[PDB]
Amino acid sequence: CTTPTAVAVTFDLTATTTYGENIYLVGSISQLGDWETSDGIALSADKYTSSDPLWYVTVTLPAGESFEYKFIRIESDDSVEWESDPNREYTVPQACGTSTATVTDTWR
Numbered sequence: 287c288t289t290p291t292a293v294a295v296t297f298d299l300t301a302t303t304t305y306g307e308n309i310y311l312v313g314s315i316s317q318l319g320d321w322e323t324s325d326g327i328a329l330s331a332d333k334y335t336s337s338d339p340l341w342y343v344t345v346t347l348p349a350g351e352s353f354e355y356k357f358i359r360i361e362s363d364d365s366v367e368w369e370s371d372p373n374r375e376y377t378v379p380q381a382c383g384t385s386t387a388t389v390t391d392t393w394r
């Protein structure tokens with residue numbers, strides 16, 4: 287059993303946008319570049335604006351262990367305000383199940 291090795295997690299975040307920007311999910315994982323949004327988890331507006339006013343998301347992480355989950359909110363001024371105030375710890379278990387959960391939050 288090694289087919290399901292990714293982690294589909296749905297994240298959401300109420301922080302409004304401006305048809306141009308991205309609110310991400312940088313969690314500490316090899317594919318979740320928590321410390322380089324280049325591989326965290328961006329959120330956008332498929333229904334909302336073009337950028338992302340409700341900041342929703344559904345990405346997959348190829349891993350199965352403890353992962354840090356810091357959040358970063360990239361604005362339209364090209365500048366990530368790595369929301370590092372709060373914090374999350376997705377312990378994705380390496381099994382045939384329990385490899386996809388939620389990850390909701392919001393901006394203060």
Ligand SMILES: OC[C@H]1O[C@@H]2O[C@H]3[C@H](O)[C@@H](O)[C@@H](O[C@H]4[C@H](O)[C@@H](O)[C@@H](O[C@H]5[C@H](O)[C@@H](O)[C@@H](O[C@H]6[C@H](O)[C@@H](O)[C@@H](O[C@H]7[C@H](O)[C@@H](O)[C@@H](O[C@H]8[C@H](O)[C@@H](O)[C@@H](O[C@H]1[C@H](O)[C@H]2O)O[C@@H]8CO)O[C@@H]7CO)O[C@@H]6CO)O[C@@H]5CO)O[C@@H]4CO)O[C@@H]3CO
Pocket residue numbers: 319320321322323366368
């Ligand atoms: O990848 C695993 C790596 O993650 C952690 O280490 C640090 C991580 O690399 C940093 O990114 C940091 O989080 C930063 C985050 O990216 C942004 O919020 C950032 O703010 C912006 C700034 O404009 C600027 O900081 C920059 O961010 C970084 C660049 O993306 C990057 O190119 C870097 O340039 C190099 C560094 O000069 C060099 O020191 C190198 O460091 C390595 C470490 O020695 C190694 O331990 C490893 O650590 C792991 C570990 O799991 C976590 O601690 O990280 C490096 C890989 O070996 O990193 C670059 C190598 O090319 O310049 C800055 C660094 O500040 O751009 C962002 C927006 O784009 O600031 C955050 C600062 O925390 O998390 C940790 C350090 O806190």
Ligand SMILES: OC[C@H]1O[C@@H]2O[C@H]3[C@H](O)[C@@H](O)[C@@H](O[C@H]4[C@H](O)[C@@H](O)[C@@H](O[C@H]5[C@H](O)[C@@H](O)[C@@H](O[C@H]6[C@H](O)[C@@H](O)[C@@H](O[C@H]7[C@H](O)[C@@H](O)[C@@H](O[C@H]8[C@H](O)[C@@H](O)[C@@H](O[C@H]1[C@H](O)[C@H]2O)O[C@@H]8CO)O[C@@H]7CO)O[C@@H]6CO)O[C@@H]5CO)O[C@@H]4CO)O[C@@H]3CO
Pocket residue numbers: 301302303304305331332333334335336338339340
């Ligand atoms: O502060 C105002 C708020 O909105 C600002 O601009 C919005 C404006 O509506 C447009 O500029 C649009 O931008 C484009 C984008 O590609 C799509 O939105 C697109 O689609 C339109 C179509 O006509 C159709 O899809 C239809 O469907 C929408 C509904 O009409 C509408 O009810 C919507 O509901 C959500 C809205 O998208 C928006 O209000 C959303 O955000 C609210 C939050 O309170 C907060 O984020 C903030 O957001 C700003 C935003 O950053 C600005 O850019 O206030 C919003 C409240 O006003 O939450 C609503 C919850 O129901 O649902 C569907 C979306 O699929 O209408 C849409 C838009 O009318 O239109 C444009 C190009 O076609 O969206 C931006 C982004 O909100």
